[PDB]
Amino acid sequence: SGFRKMAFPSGKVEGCMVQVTCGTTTLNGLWLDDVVYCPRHVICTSEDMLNPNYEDLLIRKSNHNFLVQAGNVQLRVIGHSMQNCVLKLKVDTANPKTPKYKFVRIQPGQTFSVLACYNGSPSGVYQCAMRPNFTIKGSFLNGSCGSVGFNIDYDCVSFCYMHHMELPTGVHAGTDLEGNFYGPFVDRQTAQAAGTDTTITVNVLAWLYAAVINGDRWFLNRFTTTLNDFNLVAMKYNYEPLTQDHVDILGPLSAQTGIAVLDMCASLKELLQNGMNGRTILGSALLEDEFTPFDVVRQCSGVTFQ
């Protein structure tokens, strides 16, 4: 029993981590097989990214302006290519310590674990969601660029995010593992647009099911609703509105608890509409939205495999 926001174990990743140092400016890369993945602004000492022209900067660099460290050596680089916002760094050896992976483009609302790193060394691991405006609300100090975010199920790591920048208003932006930003963001030091951060409605509902499972089943009430109904309260309070894919994802949670998705929607509104002040759900004074319906089925219910 209990409910914690767990990260995936990070061992499979701590040994894909390396240092990438161009001239100056030191940051992290991901060493898989015989390649190293890193933010292309490693090559920026030029006029900074107050207006950088990456393709013209990158041509002053040769194959061996690029030193990496993996615990202790070099790795010698026998090639490079810029691929949207990522560098690749062809090295001479395959990482003995590479596991099964894919890259994937997570879509907002979903969760991953971040292994925060500084010049190649693990600092910590935390769980996060990609906000509906494709930013993450992270914890990153200077030197953490290139840190990555991953999912696991088997012994198979599904790398999904690479940290690139801190926005001028405290939030974090990055790429998938082939260098396309999430969101409209660019890897320049300019003030970057950023829309409305919505609450991930489907995730809040998963968490209210967790609360019922793990003891706290007394935010429920005696009313019920339609999806059109709830969405007009939803839309109003800055929640992502729900459709039919959400209701079906919630399926077995409604089954193990014996509560219709729609009656759960029904009690959330009274929390969203006329609520405000007092009690407690699974230990939070807020509605949490960084658990997906799968995160819950794990922390309570339905084993995975290993």
Residue 247 binds: one of a copy of itself, Zn ion, none (C-beta under 5 to 8 A by kind): none
Residue tagged active-site, from 22, 38, 41, 44: 41
Q: 245 to 264, contacts with a copy of itself by CB under 8 A?
A: none
Are 18 and 30 a contacting pair, CB within 8 Å?
yes
Residue 2 sits in the site that holds a copy of itself (CB under 8 A): yes
Residue 291 sits in the site that holds a copy of itself (CB under 8 A): no
Q: How many residues bind a copy of itself (CB under 8 A)?
A: 47
Tokens matching residue 276: 């405000």
Distance CA 288, CA 126 (A): 15
Residue whose structure tokens are 């996060």? 128
Angle (CA) 29 35 39, round 5°: 35
- Among positions 51, 93, 139, 273, the unique one binding a copy of itself when judged by CB under 8 A: 139
Residue 124 binds: one of Zn ion, a copy of itself, none (C-beta under 5 to 8 A by kind): a copy of itself
Residue 300 sits in the site that holds a copy of itself (CB under 8 A): yes
Residue 39 binds: one of a copy of itself, Zn ion, none (C-beta under 5 to 8 A by kind): Zn ion
Residue whose structure tokens are 């990260």? 7
Residue 114 sits in the site that holds Zn ion (CB under 5 A): no
DSSP string across 152-221: ESSSEEEEEEEEEEE-TTS-EEEE-TTSPBSSS--SSSS--------B-HHHHHHHHHHHHHTT---S--
Distance CA 280, CA 258 (A): 22
Distance CA 126, CA 281 (A): 22
Residue 293 sits in the site that holds a copy of itself (CB under 8 A): no
> Closest residue (Cβ) to Zn ion?
145
Residue 145 binds: one of a copy of itself, Zn ion, none (C-beta under 5 to 8 A by kind): Zn ion
Active site residue 41: yes
The half-sphere exposure of 184 on its side-chain side, counting CA atoms within 13 A, is 7
Q: Which amino acid is at 43?
A: I
Phi, psi of 125 (to 5 degrees): -130, 135
Residue 145 sits in the site that holds Zn ion (CB under 5 A): yes
Residue 292 sits in the site that holds a copy of itself (CB under 8 A): no
Q: 187 to 216, contacts with a copy of itself by CB under 8 A?
A: 214-215
Residue tagged active-site, from 145, 160, 172, 246: 145
Q: How far is the CB of 30 from Zn ion (least distance, A)?
A: 13
Residue 9 sits in the site that holds a copy of itself (CB under 8 A): yes
Q: How far is the CB of 55 from a copy of itself (least distance, A)?
A: 30
Tokens matching residue 291: 């658990």
For the chain, the residue count is 306
Distance CA 207, CA 145 (A): 31
Residue 277 binds: one of a copy of itself, Zn ion, none (C-beta under 5 to 8 A by kind): a copy of itself
Residues at the site binding Zn ion, with contacts judged by CB under 5 A: 39, 145, 164
**Which residues participate in catalysis according to the annotation?**
41, 145
- Site residues for a copy of itself per CB under 8 A: 1-15, 115-116, 118, 121-126, 128, 137-141, 166, 170-172, 214-215, 276-277, 283-286, 298-300, 303, 306
